[PDB]
């Protein structure tokens, strides 16, 4: 409605998902996701291996935003940390 025409400086043409295991400082694996998706199922990740990840959003204006993230880092391997020994109420 009302045209809604505006050069919004936030239009992604493609998302590049780059991941590489911490045991490798070599090449990153690259997967390109269409610039209208918000999730990707990465196949080829080793279980129990720390990975480096980079989400590069290529915007139509040639604007590149690289969001660096990590995987296999949130290891909730709590060895039964019982601190509860006081009954409330």
């Amino acid at each position: 409605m009302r045209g809604s025409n505006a050069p919004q400086p936030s239009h992604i043409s493609k998302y590049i998902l780059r991941w590489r295991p911490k045991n490798s400082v070599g090449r990153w694996k690259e997967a390109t996701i269409p610039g209208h998706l918000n999730s990707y199922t990465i196949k080829g990740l080793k279980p129990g291996v720390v990975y480096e990840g980079q989400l590069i959003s290529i915007q139509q204006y040639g604007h590149q935003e690289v969001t660096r993230f990590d995987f296999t880092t949130t290891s909730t391997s709590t060895p039964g940390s019982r601190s509860h020994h006081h009954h409330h109420h």
């Binding site: 400086p9 936030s10 992604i12 998302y15 998902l17 918000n38 999730s39 990707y40 199922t41 990465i42 196949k43 080829g44 990740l45 080793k46 279980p47 990840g53 989400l55 959003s57 915007q59 604007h63 935003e65 969001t67 993230f69 995987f71």
Partner: peptide
């Protein structure tokens, strides 16, 4: 350098549903 002072940078992607060799990585685009 940090040229992008505008908030058109995707927030930290969330990794859910971890399989043996696959994940679901979800990101929020501006």
């Amino acid at each position: 350098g940090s040229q992008t002072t505008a908030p058109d940078a995707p927030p930290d992607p969330t990794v859910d549903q971890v399989d043996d060799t696959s994940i679901v990585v979800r990101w929020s685009r501006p």
